[PDB]
Symmetry: C2
Subunit: 280 residues, 2 copies
């Protein structure tokens, strides 16, 4: 996408993240393709959860979509610091341009699909870029069945980062990052534990596929989101489609950019000392 605007905050509850594309705002999940960068190579992705971070920000329902500190009980959602590890490790992306239809769950995914786009986790040597739009190639794919919701795990890396031609499938890692697998598997369950959510239960007995399953899963991810733009296609379009990158959608308001107020970066808001808590 390019650069983004920092809406001063980081927790408070006003920190509005807005990524900008070239010369003007943008829109993740919409104004963010994917199969870009050597169609026969990989694609770009967005970030909204740097490693070692108890914070969790998303992007949906706002206009152009943007990460945030999800709420629910009037307050920022801080992910527990599970004993093993720290806060949030893996980074997190969200191959924007896709949508996990709640219904349609393909074979081997009863929990059908969900709302939020797709979850992507890249093990890039460098930290995250809370909205940092960097490239990366898909490796393996992980699936997690939680609260009747078809969840999947994508493996992407900074194609530009070292270990490029080194990682091109699941097998690898084990040799390079032999401990990133099972390390991710659980960490997810307990992720809900200290919060009111016991375990989850990974799909496929608990095994993940390779890029083959990723590319496909990632492919049928955009299409499901593409065949949606159409207009009414989806019988349930609860979100902002508006896209100035598709003059073929009754939502091409290329004027929804200037409207976006200029960035207002303030300062990282202090986080309750409750976080940094190793929940065993």
């Amino acid at each position: 996408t390019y650069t983004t605007r920092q809406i001063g905050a980081k927790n408070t509850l006003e920190y509005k993240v807005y990524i900008e594309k070239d010369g003007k705002p943008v829109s993740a999940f919409h104004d963010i393709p994917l199969y870009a960068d050597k169609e026969d190579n990989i694609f770009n992705m967005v970030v909204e959860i740097p490693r070692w971070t108890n914070a969790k920000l998303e992007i949906t329902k706002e206009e152009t979509l943007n990460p945030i500190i999800q709420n629910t009980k009037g307050k920022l959602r801080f992910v527990r610091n599970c004993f093993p590890h720290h806060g949030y490790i893996h980074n997190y992306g969200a191959f924007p341009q896709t949508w996990e239809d709640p219904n349609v769950s393909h074979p081997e995914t009863k929990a059908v699909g969900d709302n939020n786009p797709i979850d992507v986790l890249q093990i890039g040597e460098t930290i995250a870029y809370t909205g940092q739009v960097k490239e990366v190639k898909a490796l393996g794919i992980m699936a997690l069945l939680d609260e009747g919701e078809t969840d999947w795990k994508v493996i992407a890396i900074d194609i530009n980062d070292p270990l490029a031609p080194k990682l091109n499938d699941i097998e690898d890692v084990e040799k390079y990052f032999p401990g990133l697998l099972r390390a991710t598997d659980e960490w997810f369950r307990i992720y809900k534990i200290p919060d009111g959510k016991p375990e989850n239960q990974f799909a496929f007995s608990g095994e993940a596929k390779n890029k083959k399953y990723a590319l496909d899963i990632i492919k049928e991810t955009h299409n499901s989101w593409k065949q949606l733009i159409a207009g009414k296609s989806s019988d349930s379009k609860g979100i902002d489609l508006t896209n100035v990158t598709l003059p073929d959608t009754p939502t091409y308001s290329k004027a929804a950019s200037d409207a976006i107020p200029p960035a207002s970066p303030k300062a990282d808001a202090p986080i309750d000392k409750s976080i940094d808590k190793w929940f065993f």
Copy 2:
């Protein structure tokens, strides 16, 4: 001790940390007792390595002692981010007022003793205070024999922090923080690995004692440092003893406080992206 002055930096190489006691500077390892706070309870300690931190700062040879980013090869010493875990986890203290005499190693400590004071690691819910002088009670004690050097591990916690009357011995943790033990054991070895230092090899086959061994080990720690102040006592006094808290030492220059230039906190200096590296 009280408050301290931040010598702007955090890495650059000018970040000079200087803790202040009440109304005036101080001196760790010297102007920092220990058996203070219910002689029949615990004692205070200093910090210089917050959890999840690849940075390593000490305090010795400067005047009043102060943490730093040890060098050796013209450059800040950044601890690897070993795969398992992150950067630096445990915090780290240094029951100032003691000294591990290079010679004299008691029975069960061939590698005799070393220089640096004593290493202390407290699992306080709250983060560290790079120099934060907080209380805490001693629990267990760990020893590590590396490069012919009698190293020990102290277990202290924010007596004020939760899990107080809960933790009072090694056994515990296992139930409270069942995973903090072995978690510390190694993490140390590989600590040198990605740097040029293979493994280490914990002492006592690799087992640690309880508070009993800690209190004693911690006790004979100060004495060894006390019987030193005397003056020449130690045949090798390579450091600054100057102490304005002991008008009984040819180094009681209570005037070494005003001299200390006022704090000059600047801003956290950017750290090479080389750090945040999970070395498997």
